[PDB]
Amino acid sequence: KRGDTISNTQGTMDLEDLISKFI
Amino acid sequence: SRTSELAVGIFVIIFGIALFFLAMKVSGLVGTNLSDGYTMKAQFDNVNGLKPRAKVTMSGVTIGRVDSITLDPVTRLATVTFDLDGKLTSFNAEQLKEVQKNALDELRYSS
Amino acid sequence: SRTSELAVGIFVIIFGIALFFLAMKVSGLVGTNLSDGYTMKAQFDNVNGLKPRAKVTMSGVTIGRVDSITLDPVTRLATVTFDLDGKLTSFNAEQLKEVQKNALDELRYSSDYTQATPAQQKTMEQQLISNMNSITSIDEDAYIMVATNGLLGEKYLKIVPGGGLNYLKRGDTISNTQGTMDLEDLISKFI
Amino acid sequence: KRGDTISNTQGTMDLEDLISKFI
Amino acid sequence: SRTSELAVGIFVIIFGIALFFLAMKVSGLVGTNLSDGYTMKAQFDNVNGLKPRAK
Amino acid sequence: MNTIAWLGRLVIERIRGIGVAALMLLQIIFSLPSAGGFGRFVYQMHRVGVMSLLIITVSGLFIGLVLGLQGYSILVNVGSESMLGTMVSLTLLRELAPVVAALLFAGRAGSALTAEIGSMKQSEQLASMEMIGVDPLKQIVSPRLWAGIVSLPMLTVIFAAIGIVGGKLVGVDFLGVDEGSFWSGMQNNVQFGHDVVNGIIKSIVFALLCTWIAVFQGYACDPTPEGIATAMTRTVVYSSLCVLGFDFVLTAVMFG
Amino acid sequence: LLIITVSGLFIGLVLGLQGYSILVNVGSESMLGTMVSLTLLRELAPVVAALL
Amino acid sequence: TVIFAAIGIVGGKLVGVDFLGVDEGSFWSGMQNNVQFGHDVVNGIIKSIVFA
Ligand SMILES: CCCCCC/C=C/CCCCCCCCCC(=O)O[C@H](COC(=O)CCCCCCCCCCCCCCC)COP(=O)(O)OC[C@@H](O)CO
Ligand SMILES: CCCCCC/C=C/CCCCCCCCCC(=O)O[C@H](COC(=O)CCCCCCCCCCCCCCC)COP(=O)(O)OC[C@@H](O)CO
Ligand SMILES: CCCCCC/C=C/CCCCCCCCCC(=O)O[C@H](COC(=O)CCCCCCCCCCCCCCC)COP(=O)(O)OC[C@@H](O)CO
Ligand SMILES: CCCCCC/C=C\CCCCCCCCCC(=O)O[C@H](COC(=O)CCCCCCCCCCCCCCC)COP(=O)(O)OC[C@@H](O)CO
Ligand SMILES: CCCCCC/C=C\CCCCCCCCCC(=O)O[C@H](COC(=O)CCCCCCCCCCCCCCC)COP(=O)(O)OC[C@@H](O)CO
Ligand SMILES: CCCCCC/C=C\CCCCCCCCCC(=O)O[C@H](COC(=O)CCCCCCCCCCCCCCC)COP(=O)(O)OC[C@@H](O)CO
Ligand SMILES: CCCCCC/C=C\CCCCCCCCCC(=O)O[C@H](COC(=O)CCCCCCCCCCCCCCC)COP(=O)(O)OC[C@@H](O)CO
Numbered sequence: 001k002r003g004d005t006i007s008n009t010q011g012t013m014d015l016e017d018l019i020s021k022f023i
Numbered sequence: 024s025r026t027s028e029l030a031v032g033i034f035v036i037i038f039g040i041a042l043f044f045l046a047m048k049v050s051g052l053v054g055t056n057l058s059d060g061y062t063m064k065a066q067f068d069n070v071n072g073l074k075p076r077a078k079v080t081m082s083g084v085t086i087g088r089v090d091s092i093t094l095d096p097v098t099r100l101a102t103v104t105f106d107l108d109g110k111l112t113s114f115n116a117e118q119l120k121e122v123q124k125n126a127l128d129e130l131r132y133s134s
Numbered sequence: 135s136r137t138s139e140l141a142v143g144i145f146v147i148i149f150g151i152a153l154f155f156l157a158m159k160v161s162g163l164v165g166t167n168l169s170d171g172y173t174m175k176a177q178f179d180n181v182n183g184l185k186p187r188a189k190v191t192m193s194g195v196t197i198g199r200v201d202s203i204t205l206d207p208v209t210r211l212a213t214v215t216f217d218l219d220g221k222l223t224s225f226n227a228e229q230l231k232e233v234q235k236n237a238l239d240e241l242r243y244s245s246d247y248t249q250a251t252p253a254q255q256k257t258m259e260q261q262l263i264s265n266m267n268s269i270t271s272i273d274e275d276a277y278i279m280v281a282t283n284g285l286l287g288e289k290y291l292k293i294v295p296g297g298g299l300n301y302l303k304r305g306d307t308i309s310n311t312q313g314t315m316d317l318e319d320l321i322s323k324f325i
Numbered sequence: 326k327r328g329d330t331i332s333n334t335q336g337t338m339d340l341e342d343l344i345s346k347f348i
Numbered sequence: 349s350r351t352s353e354l355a356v357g358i359f360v361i362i363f364g365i366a367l368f369f370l371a372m373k374v375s376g377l378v379g380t381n382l383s384d385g386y387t388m389k390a391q392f393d394n395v396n397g398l399k400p401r402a403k
Numbered sequence: 404m405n406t407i408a409w410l411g412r413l414v415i416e417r418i419r420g421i422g423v424a425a426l427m428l429l430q431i432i433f434s435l436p437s438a439g440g441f442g443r444f445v446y447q448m449h450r451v452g453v454m455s456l457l458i459i460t461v462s463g464l465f466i467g468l469v470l471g472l473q474g475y476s477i478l479v480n481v482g483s484e485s486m487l488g489t490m491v492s493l494t495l496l497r498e499l500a501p502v503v504a505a506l507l508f509a510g511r512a513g514s515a516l517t518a519e520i521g522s523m524k525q526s527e528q529l530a531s532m533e534m535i536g537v538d539p540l541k542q543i544v545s546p547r548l549w550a551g552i553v554s555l556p557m558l559t560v561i562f563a564a565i566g567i568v569g570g571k572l573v574g575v576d577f578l579g580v581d582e583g584s585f586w587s588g589m590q591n592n593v594q595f596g597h598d599v600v601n602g603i604i605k606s607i608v609f610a611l612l613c614t615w616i617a618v619f620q621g622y623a624c625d626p627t628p629e630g631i632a633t634a635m636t637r638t639v640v641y642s643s644l645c646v647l648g649f650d651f652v653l654t655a656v657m658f659g
Numbered sequence: 660l661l662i663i664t665v666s667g668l669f670i671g672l673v674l675g676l677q678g679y680s681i682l683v684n685v686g687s688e689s690m691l692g693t694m695v696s697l698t699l700l701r702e703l704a705p706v707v708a709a710l711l
Numbered sequence: 712t713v714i715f716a717a718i719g720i721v722g723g724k725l726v727g728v729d730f731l732g733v734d735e736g737s738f739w740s741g742m743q744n745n746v747q748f749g750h751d752v753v754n755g756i757i758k759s760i761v762f763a
Pocket of ligand 7: 368
């Protein structure tokens with residue numbers, strides 16, 4: 001509806017996030 | 024005096040032209056006007072770098088802006104409130120029927 | 135009236151100095167404009183690129199600043215002193231009683247009922263009067279780390295919360311850190 | 326002691342050899 | 349009130365010289381010291397890009 | 404200590420001069436308006452504003468030509484020639500158009516205000532107006548102060564507009580960057596409230612300082628033909644130090 | 660000599676404050692002395708000292 | 712203009728190194744690498760002789 005909450009998120013990916021993905 | 028009042032009136036015409044060029048050719052001012060936009064909100068775990076008045080896109084098309092980002096220190100997840108649009112994201116007369124019959128058909132199929 | 139005009143000319147200069155130091159405080163170059171900022175500290179093993187007056191964030195929203203970084207050569211670990219924030223890194227009585235009745239029942243749960251003497255939450259009365267004075271929203275096993283603001287920006291300190299039943303008082307030392315990621319020695323292994 | 330020589334080093338690694346390795 | 353004119357003239361010359369000593373300090377020009385620094389040395393095989401007065 | 408006494412006597416009379424100029428400003432802006440005072444203001448918008456329109460227009464074009472020529476040489480080596488319109492418009496709007504347009508206003512329209520008021524004092528038109536029963540601070544000084552506070556923020560907007568047009572002319576039309584990427588990168592990173600309005604707030608602070616100095620030095624002049632000329636070079640020196648001094652304070656607040 | 664000395668100090672203060680904000684977002688704060696000295700030596704010191 | 716450019720670099724070093732906290736040795740070494748004397752310093756003096 002109008003005004004609800006989207007309930008699946010994921011935050012930003014900075015440099016330390018990109019590294020821990022590849023390993 | 025009739026010349027000096029005539030020449031000052033030209034100094035206000037050239038000022039109004041330059042304020043028009045600065046506002047509506049150089050800045051993003053004319054492109055911030057949302058049509059009957061509602062308001063949703065989501066809750067993240069890292070919003071680092073997200074500023075207010077940032078952009079919301081669906082398929083590469085801008086459909087809103089970002090209003091406010093706060094903590095909520097009882098759950099410690101950041102809460103973003105964003106306001107979308109009327110035309111590009113809400114349905115209309117023909118489209119509502121086009122999803123009303125299929126939502127019954129996706130429900131009352133053979134399965 | 136040479137003295138009446140000279141006193142006005144001195145008052146204009148002092149007003150121009152007071153406006154200067156008000157502008158440096160607002161800009162952030164001198165002082166600390168946040169909200170009843172208490173002080174925490176932590177001990178890292180590599181703080182390369184971290185400068186004083188840097189940023190501390192919880193989930194991306196800025197909750198503090200860095201004060202000073204010293205070395206301590208007997209242990210050879212850097213010690214970052216940072217001051218946080220009272221307004222939004224803590225909670226007040228409505229949320230504080232919300233975790234007063236929470237932490238009494240959760241710590242004295244169905245397991246810890248048959249683990250001590252029959253006090254019947256008498257010790258739960260002692261723990262809650264130590265709770266209200268000077269408590270933070272940082273749980274006992276959150277870990278702080280040195281993050282890097284994009285791909286090429288400056289470095290800040292990120293507090294990653296998770297789990298935790300106890301909480302940290304105002305002034306303690308966060309006991310789980312990790313330093314900056316040496317992107318030299320990452321590639322040195324990958325060859 | 327003050328004045329000695331650190332006898333464990335490793336030099337720098339240029340980006341030409343990095344590519345050389347990563348073929 | 350010659351003594352008031354004699355005092356403000358002194359503070360202007362005092363502040364004018366103390367600006368000059370502070371200017372030559374904030375630059376390699378004279379000074380550039382370190383808190384009783386001893387000296388070590390090391391042997392490498394490639395120092396490509398290292399320049400004196402590094403850290 | 405013969406010159407040390409002369410140096411201390413010099414800076415005391417300058418401190419006392421700020422006290423007279425502060426009380427002179429509070430007597431102008433805190434008073435009731437009067438009869439026929441709007442028409443005297445529109446006449447002084449012609450002498451201060453319209454007369455300065457030719458130095459401001461040509462100097463803004465020449466500065467935008469250098470910015471588009473120097474900014475192309477930096478950005479082309481890092482693969483970001485599409486950010487040329489962003490760096491040209493953001494250099495003018497927050498640094499160069501408030502400051503350089505205030506250094507040419509202090510030279511042309513500031514030094515001409517302290518010569519007009521100063522020759523009224525020498526030829527005793529200010530003493531003749533006072534003995535008739537008309538305050539010369541309201542009749543003569545007050546239209547000239549308000550015409551400078553209005554005309555300088557109107558002239559840095561024209562300065563910044565031709566600087567961007569001049570930088571587009573060397574960048575797009577001679578060095579050959581894409582026209583659609585010039586304006587789209589500018590409309591993305593330049594905000595109106597943070598970059599355009601913050602440049603107008605600077606030029607209102609500068610217009611108050613450049614005109615209050617120029618008006619005071621002609622009123623408190625020395626009615627002697629080389630006492631007027633000593634005053635005209637004091638409004639160019641004192642306004643330039645106040646423009647560059649208040650510019651550091653305003654960028655540390657707005658963009659720091 | 661007194662207008663030139665004080666105006667040169669005030670302009671270098673703005674260049675080091677504005678040039679830090681640009682360079683810190685691209686990881687090149689070590690190029691601060693290059694852009695401060697090259698802005699003065701080829702653009703600002705010939706032009707602003709000739710306007711004063 | 713040589714005195715103008717010298718205090719502008721000293722003023723920019725004072726806000727950059729001594730207040731914002733960049734490395735002092737990288738301030739001067741990046742400057743001594745990219746700034747040439749004949750192309751950047753002498754070309755600023757040739758400008759100020761034409762202006763004078
Ligand atoms: C009531 C409204 C108050 C608003 C102002 C608030 C800020 C106050 C600070 C400075 C204001 C200066 C403006 C002065 C206006 C009158 C100018 C003037 O005329 O005063 C002159 C003083 O110099 C001078 O301004 C000094 C000229 C050079 C100034 C250089 C310093 C500028 C640096 C500013 C730093 C920012 C500080 C403020 C930031 C909040 C002296 O006059 P003279 O002709 O020599 O005396 C006549 C006799 O000597 C005869 O020979
Ligand atoms: C991290 C934060 C990012 C910034 C968020 C802002 C978003 C952009 C939106 C809007 C822009 C706000 C930026 C601050 C605006 C500066 C205000 C200012 O600088 O105020 C000026 C003071 O100037 C003088 O005295 C010279 C004196 C200067 C010292 C004044 C100290 C200012 C302290 C109050 C300003 C609050 C700043 C709010 C910004 C966070 C007054 O300007 P005028 O109205 O023309 O008055 C005309 C004068 O003649 C006075 O009679
Ligand atoms: C791709 C190439 C890279 C560059 C390589 C250069 C390497 C750097 C080393 C040295 C720097 C050379 C750069 C060119 C120097 C500019 C010369 C110049 O600009 O000449 C000036 C002419 O100025 C005026 O008329 C204003 C008139 C200006 C029009 C003059 C046209 C100049 C044409 C001859 C210059 C040859 C340029 C050589 C550079 C390739 C004269 O300067 P002054 O000696 O002070 O004379 C004093 C004046 O009062 C005249 O009485
Ligand atoms: C979207 C982008 C936005 C940009 C908006 C556009 C920007 C503005 C555009 C154009 C602005 C043009 C400026 C017009 C200047 C108007 C000046 C003016 O109009 O002033 C006149 C005099 O100008 C005078 O000196 C005559 C002044 C000198 C004449 C000029 C002579 C030089 C030109 C000749 C040489 C050609 C140039 C060389 C090219 C190769 C007034 O005459 P006065 O006798 O003094 O006063 C009379 C009063 O008592 C009663 O009337
Ligand atoms: C701490 C906060 C500082 C800012 C707050 C101050 C705000 C109020 C300002 C008050 C101004 C003082 C008023 C009394 C002094 C009179 C000023 C003056 O005397 O004016 C000029 C000098 O000003 C000058 O030094 C410029 C005068 C200001 C000096 C500033 C320069 C030093 C400041 C240090 C910079 C700080 C950071 C660096 C620290 C290492 C004199 O130039 P003249 O040689 O006469 O030119 C000749 C013509 O004028 C005649 O035809
Ligand atoms: C935040 C509050 C407002 C900001 C201001 C803050 C400053 C403090 C308050 C200022 C206002 C107080 C009101 C009193 C004004 C006192 C000045 C005054 O009253 O001056 C008057 C001039 O008219 C005049 O307003 C000059 C006539 C009007 C001048 C201004 C014209 C405005 C047009 C441009 C406005 C820009 C808006 C555009 C936005 C895009 C009277 O002068 P005279 O008639 O010649 O006297 C002669 C006789 O006495 C003897 O011969
Ligand atoms: C490595 C980096 C390289 C950098 C190199 C260093 C750069 C240069 C360093 C310092 C330069 C300082 C400038 C000195 C100025 C000398 C001016 C001078 O010396 O001029 C004198 C007057 O100055 C006068 O007005 C007195 C002038 C006004 C006095 C100043 C008053 C303002 C200061 C007081 C306020 C304090 C500032 C506020 C701080 C908070 C001469 O007197 P006259 O009677 O006119 O002539 C007499 C002749 O007939 C015969 O003698």
